[PDB]
Design a protein around this nucleic acid. Structure first.
Ligand SMILES: C=C1[C@H](COP(=O)(O)OP(=O)(O)OP(=O)(O)O)[C@@H](O)C[C@@H]1n1cnc2c(=O)nc(N)[nH]c21
Ligand SMILES: OC[C@H]1O[C@@](CO)(O[C@H]2O[C@H](CO)[C@@H](O)[C@H](O)[C@H]2O)[C@@H](O)[C@@H]1O
Ligand SMILES: [Mg+2]
Lengths: 407, 551
DNA sequence: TCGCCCCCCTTCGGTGCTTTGCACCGAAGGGGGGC
């Protein structure tokens, strides 16, 4: 019973037309049970094929909350949706979030279902539930309310969210709240138990009008390391020179003329070559240029974030986040702790959620990922491990590791 | 009939079609006048006049019955101007996805599209004029009041209508399985035959109130049921008979037909192969070009012919048992698989033979096969099977720890069915003590076409070969080829080509490139090879010297 | 002389790279099958 906010696509762009991929039995059953109730409650309506748009649908379970959560992959719809920096409905990002001891993520997407969506925009939200062995044609719905996963919903609901949170933030001025899509990121410098208690006060505050625990305090940077030995092969020095030559695209004033000269001639790779005093000075020089962060690298909010990941083995994953090439805003090392150690695709899917989560905390948005995996291998399995209510942009790269740069 | 109409639009800024009708005859347009008089009496079509400015041509073909005719209108022009639709048919039901049912019925709706009304505002665009007599006089004109056969919106709007009509019966009868494919209804239940038939009568009556007849001619009550190109027996299912062309002289188009039939056969006939027959299609230039069968293609064809003469059947799905998928390697990037739950009782078979990428290996293609089967299993049964794979656990372990991209296979157990999938060589992680060290380099001139490949070694050996009609990347591969050719069973190679290192490090065992194939063959014969990279033009080590020389 | 759907095999053409050809990938040609 609210006036709708008029919404448009970007000029010269049509709505999404993305095919539904196959779903397992239990995801299909969960979706039909979820969508039947949503239909009864008027949140979605059954539509026909004269609607030419579609967006893929699937479902996830977070391991702590074992009820299914419907997830519509509105990435295509969001790229074509008008920006809301123009209607002054965008959300600023608080720089204090990343300096908190603990940050808890809450899924508040259900709040959107109380605000209707522009009559003329709902056709762009259509999705299709598949059927096992194609017993029936797909079943089609569209939204009548602000959907979960649509970039417009936090923008339109924002004035409402501010009002609901104003008392809590008033009473807790040192707690930091940042909304990103369907999520609230809740940071505090408080001991673990009392943090969780104010989390629950938060919760009941929300429930009244209408938890996954981070420690950014303990994210670290993993710089480039140069091996340390006392005897050095020709092969070691070749490996060392190629690494430093690459790092000179990133760091300033890194030299290889002293180490390179040690390799005059055509030598056996296993020949041990003693280091001249000068070469030892050049390497100690290089070593501590790599010690400390690069000078001249600043976040630009008008450019996209990009993330690269390299598989390093034994469950270790290195990553860099940047906007311009070789100007890394962050370099890191993800390591999983599940002990099972068996699944590359699961580890990479979890590495992606963690990296994207860090970017949300730090900069307020997720990066576009360059994924070290075949397209078809990622697409066979990734939804089995996804636990976020958002989905980042990604693309698939096959880049062999020339130097083992980041490990 | 009393269904609510589905509103439809032309694409923005577009008008309706304005073409002309064809070959204009006494026989043809008196047959035309007869054809439509009964449709008009049914209300399916209405006479129109010249203030309707649109037109489209019409024709007819024979039905599967093959005394009946099928009215068709060449709506190609109208279709391009009609709004797009989101198609609700997402796939094709498969008999291996059916569970055993106590009582089964197959029904079909009569004159299905003609029972669904067309948007009143859109009808004027379906105009077809049937001329007067061989273009003497003004001409007879009709428009559709119902879904036309040939219009791109018709199948979607029919399916959507059929779904709405069935919905009350489905929710009311959730223990009755109804496969709905276009106007074809498979109905299975675990009720006794007498109750089953009572539920069918109810369903037929419900369809009839909504204007969908179910004529007795297409009402199947007894096995074997003819369904979706198959025969459904109580315990098993067969494909309807596949007849392969038996030409003495083969055109390209003949070969294309044959490969298609074999692919269709491969869903239940194990071990079908089409690589050699498909090879004959490459580089050809006309569908009527005669193509002589190679010896390999004749052998492949004879092998499949043997397979096809044996009768086969699939069984039905039992949800309380596991799905199992077993894969065998057939050579030249061909794979074949069977899916079963009890041994020697296949639900279905299949094959994977796609060549993805210029350079690859058997482990990657096995991984691809696994992914194809995983996708199809989810489509058909809603879950992934357990895999039986002809690859050792050590081999797989060796692969996913060295290979830099993330990769994975779900729960699988080794099955010893040679030939097994294996890595054919593995690059050393450290330089080999006592092995010669080759510094290789190749360069080509972009304009020239001309290049050089050569090496320089720590044992004083050196060599340069001139190359014509080459590229920069080829001379680098060529340089590596040369070192492998001239070196012992253990060798250390240092290149400045990220490109060449990239291909070789992925351990390919096959390639569309003859040069890369030769390198692979050389790598397989070596005992140990360490391959290292250095940046070019940095005056490094032996790299500078070999660089020196190919200039 | 038609429509819509799935599948496979081949060919073509757009994209982006610290490239100058190469690898990747989507679309469209042919075929099979369904209604
Ligand atoms: C699936 C379809 C319905 C049921 O297919 P159907 O074989 O049962 O035909 P229908 O029920 O009408 O007559 P019936 O009384 O003998 O059952 C038909 O309406 C129309 C559609 N269809 C089928 N084939 C063709 C075709 O080639 N070209 C076109 N444009 N459309 C076709
Ligand atoms: O993985 C790419 C694959 O996913 C689809 C959805 O089926 O596209 C999604 O992912 C892309 C990569 O970020 C987005 O650009 C796109 O908007 C989103 O729908 C397929 O389109 C694509 O093949
Ligand atoms: Mg029919």
């Amino acid at each position: 019973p609210i006036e709708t906010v008029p919404v448009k696509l970007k000029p010269g762009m049509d709505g999404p037309k993305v095919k539904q991929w196959p779903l397992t039995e239990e995801k299909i059953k969960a979706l039909v049970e979820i969508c039947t109730e949503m239909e009864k409650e008027g949140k979605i309506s059954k539509i026909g094929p004269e609607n030419p748009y579609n967006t893929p649908v699937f479902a996830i379970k977070k391991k702590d909350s074992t009820k299914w959560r419907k997830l519509v992959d509105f990435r295509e719809l969001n790229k074509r949706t008008q920006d809301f920096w123009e209607v002054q409905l965008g959300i600023p990002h608080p720089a204090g979030l990343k300096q908190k001891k603990s940050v808890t993520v809450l899924d508040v997407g259900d709040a959107y279902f109380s605000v209707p969506l522009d009559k003329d925009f709902r056709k762009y939200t259509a999705f299709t539930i598949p059927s096992i062995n194609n017993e029936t044609p797909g079943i089609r719905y569209q939204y009548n309310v602000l959907p979960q996963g649509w970039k417009g919903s936090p923008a339109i609901f924002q004035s409402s969210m501010t009002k609901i949170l104003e008392p809590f933030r008033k009473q807790n001025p040192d707690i930091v709240i940042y909304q990103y899509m369907d999520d609230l990121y809740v940071g505090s410098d408080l001991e673990i138990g009392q943090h969780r208690t104010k989390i629950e006060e938060l919760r009941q505050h929300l429930l009244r009008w209408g938890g996954y625990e981070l420690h950014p305090d303990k994210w670290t940077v993993q710089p480039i390391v140069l091996p340390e030995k006392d005897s050095w092969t020709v092969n070691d020095i070749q490996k060392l020179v190629g690494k430093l030559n690459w790092a000179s695209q990133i760091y300033a004033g890194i030299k290889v003329r002293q180490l390179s000269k040690l390799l005059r001639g055509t030598k056996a790779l296993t020949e041990v070559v003693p280091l001249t005093e000068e070469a030892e000075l050049e390497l100690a020089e290089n070593r501590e240029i790599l010690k400390e962060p690069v000078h001249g690298v600043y976040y630009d909010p008008s450019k996209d974030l990009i993330a690269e990941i390299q598989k390093q083995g034994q469950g270790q994953w290195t990553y860099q986040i940047y906007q311009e090439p070789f100007k890394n805003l962050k370099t890191g090392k993800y390591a999983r702790m599940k002990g099972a150690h068996t699944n590359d695709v699961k580890q990479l899917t979890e590495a992606v959620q963690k990296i994207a989560t860090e970017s949300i905390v730090i900069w307020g948005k997720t990066p576009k990922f360059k994924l070290p995996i075949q397209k078809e291998t990622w697409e066979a399995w990734w939804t089995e491990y996804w636990q976020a209510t958002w989905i980042p942009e990604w693309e698939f790269v096959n880049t062999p590791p020339l130097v083992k740069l980041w490990y | 009939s009393p269904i609510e109409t589905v509103p439809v639009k032309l694409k923005p800024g577009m008008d309706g079609p304005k073409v002309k009708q064809w070959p204009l005859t006494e026989e043809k347009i008196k047959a035309l006048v007869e054809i439509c008089t009964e449709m008009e009496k049914e209300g399916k079509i209405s006479k129109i006049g010249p203030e309707n400015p649109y037109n489209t041509p019409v024709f007819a073909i024979k039905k599967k019955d093959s005394t009946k005719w099928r009215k068709l209108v060449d709506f190609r022009e109208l279709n391009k101007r009609t709004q797009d639709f989101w198609e609700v048919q997402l796939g094709i039901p498969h008999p291996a996805g059916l569970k055993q049912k106590k009582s089964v019925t197959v029904l079909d709706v009569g004159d299905a599209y003609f029972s669904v009304p067309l948007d009143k505002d859109f009808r004027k665009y379906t105009a077809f004029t049937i001329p007067s007599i061989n273009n003497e006089t003004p001409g007879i004109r009709y428009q559709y009041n119902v879904l036309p056969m040939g219009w791109k919106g018709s199948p979607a709007i029919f399916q959507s209508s059929m779904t709405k009509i069935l919905e009350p019966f489905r929710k009311q009868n959730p223990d009755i399985v109804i496969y709905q494919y276009m106007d074809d209804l498979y109905v299975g239940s675990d009720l006794e035959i007498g109750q089953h038939r009572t539920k069918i009568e109810e369903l037929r009556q419900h369809l009839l109130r909504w204007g969908f007849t179910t004529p007795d001619k297409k009402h199947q009550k007894e096995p074997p049921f003819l369904w979706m190109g198959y025969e459904l027996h109580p315990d098993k299912w067969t494909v309807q008979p596949i007849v392969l062309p038996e030409k003495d002289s083969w055109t390209v188009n003949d070969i294309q037909k044959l490969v298609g039939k074999l692919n269709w056969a491969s869903q239940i006939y194990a071990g079908i192969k089409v690589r050699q027959l498909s090879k004959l299609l490459r580089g050809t230039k006309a569908l009527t070009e005669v193509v002589p069968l190679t010896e390999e293609a004749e052998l492949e064809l004879a092998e499949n012919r043997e397979i096809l003469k044996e009768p086969v059947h699939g069984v039905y799905y039992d949800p309380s048992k596991d799905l199992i998928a077993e894969i065998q390697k057939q050579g030249q990037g061909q794979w074949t698989y069977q899916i079963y739950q009890e041994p020697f009782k296949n639900l279905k078979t299949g094959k994977y033979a796609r060549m993805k990428g210029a350079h690859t290996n058997d482990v990657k293609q096995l991984t691809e096969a696994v992914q194809k089967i995983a996708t199809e299993s989810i489509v058909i049964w809603g879950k992934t099977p357990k895999f039986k794979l002809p690859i050792q656990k050590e081999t797989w372990e060796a692969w996913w720890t060295e290979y830099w991209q993330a990769t994975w296979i779900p729960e699988w157990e080794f099955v010893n069915t040679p030939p097994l999938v294996k890595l054919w060589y593995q690059l050393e992680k450290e330089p080999i003590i006592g092995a010669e060290t080759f510094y290789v380099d190749g360069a080509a001139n972009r304009e020239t076409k001309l290049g050089k490949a050569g090496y320089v070694t720590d044992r004083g050996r050196q060599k340069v070969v001139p190359l014509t009609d080459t590229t920069n990347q080829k001379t680098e591969l060529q340089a590596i080829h040369l070192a492998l050719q001239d070196s012992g069973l253990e060798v250390n190679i240092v290149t400045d080509s990220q490109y060449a290192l990239g291909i070789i490090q992925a351990q390919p065992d096959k390639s569309e490139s003859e040069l890369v194939s030769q390198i692979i063959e050389q790598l397989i014969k070596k005992e140990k090879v360490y391959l290292a990279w250095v940046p070019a033009h940095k005056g490094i080590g032996g790299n500078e010297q070999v660089d020196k020389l190919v200039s």
